[PDB]
C-alpha cells in the first residue's frame, strides 16, 4: 500500500479534501489506505469510504454503458464493421471496473465485515458487499454470472435480516439497503414483482414510524422514502 507511510488521521483529512475537490480516485485511495490501517471505521469514515468508491465506480458504469450501447449498435443487422476497437475499449473499461469492485470487496472481506458487530456498521458493509457484487453482475456474462448474482443476493439478504431485527423501519441505512435490494430484484434478478413488493412494504412501514422522529431524522428518512416512491412510479 502506497498509503502505508501516512498517518490514519491524515488519510481521513485528505479524503475529505479530495471530496471537496471532486477528486474521487484520490478520495478512494486515501480511504483504502485508512481501512488498511486495520482499525474499525467510525460512521463518518464508513460514509467517506462509500462516497469515494461509489463515485469512482459510478463513472466507470456510465462509461461502460455508453460503450456497450455503441458496441451493440455496431453488431446490428446492417452495420459497417469497424474492427475490434469498440469491443477492446469496452473490455478495458470493464476490466478496470471489475478491479475497483474487487478492491472494495477485498476491503470488506479483509477485514471490515468480520469486525463489524453493531447493526449500523454490519448492515452498512453488507449492503456495500451486495452493491459491488451487483455492479460485477451488471457486466458479467460467463460461467460465474449466476454465482455473482447469488453473492449479491446473499449479502443483501443477510443485511436485510439484521436490519429488520435491529433497526427501526425509518433508519436511513435500512431504507437505502431496501431501495438497492429492490433495484437488484428488478434489474439483475429479473424479479420485478419482488422489487415492487419490497419497495412498497419498505415505504409503508417507514411512513408508519415517521411520527417517532425528530425534524432532522424525518428529513433523512423521507428523502430515501421519496426514492422508493420514484422507483415505484417508474415501475407501475
Amino acid at each position: 500500500g502506497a498509503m502505508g507511510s501516512m498517518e490514519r488521521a491524515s488519510l481521513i483529512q485528505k479524503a475529505k479534501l479530495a471530496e471537496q475537490a471532486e477528486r474521487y480516485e484520490d478520495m478512494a485511495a486515501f480511504m483504502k489506505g485508512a481501512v488498511e490501517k486495520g482499525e474499525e471505521l467510525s460512521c463518518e469514515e464508513r460514509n467517506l469510504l462509500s462516497v469515494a468508491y461509489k463515485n469512482v465506480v459510478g463513472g466507470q458504469r456510465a462509461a461502460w454503458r455508453v460503450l456497450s450501447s455503441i458496441e451493440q449498435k455496431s453488431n446490428e443487422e446492417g452495420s459497417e464493421e469497424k474492427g475490434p476497437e469498440v469491443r477492446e475499449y469496452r473490455e478495458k473499461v470493464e476490466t478496470e471496473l471489475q478491479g475497483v469492485c474487487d478492491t472494495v470487496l477485498g476491503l470488506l472481506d479483509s477485514h471490515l465485515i468480520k469486525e463489524a458487530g453493531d447493526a449500523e456498521s454490519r448492515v452498512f458493509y453488507l449492503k456495500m458487499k451486495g452493491d459491488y457484487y451487483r455492479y460485477l453482475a451488471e457486466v458479467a456474462t460467463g460461467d460465474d454470472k449466476k454465482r455473482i448474482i447469488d453473492s449479491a443476493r446473499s449479502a443483501y439478504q443477510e443485511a436485510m435480516d439484521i436490519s429488520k431485527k435491529e433497526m427501526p423501519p425509518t433508519n436511513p441505512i435500512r431504507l437505502g439497503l431496501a431501495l438497492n435490494f429492490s433495484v437488484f430484484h428488478y434489474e439483475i434478478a429479473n424479479s420485478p414483482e419482488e422489487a415492487i413488493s419490497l419497495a412498497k412494504t419498505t415505504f409503508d412501514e417507514a411512513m408508519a414510524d415517521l411520527h417517532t422522529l425528530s425534524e432532522d431524522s424525518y428529513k433523512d428518512s423521507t428523502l430515501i422514502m421519496q426514492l422508493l416512491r420514484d422507483n415505484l412510479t417508474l415501475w407501475t
Binding site: 452493491d131 438497492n180 415501475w235
Partner: peptide, 5 residues
C-alpha cells in the same frame, strides 16, 4: 435508471 444510494 432507477434510484440507488
Amino acid at each position: 435508471f432507477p434510484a440507488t444510494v
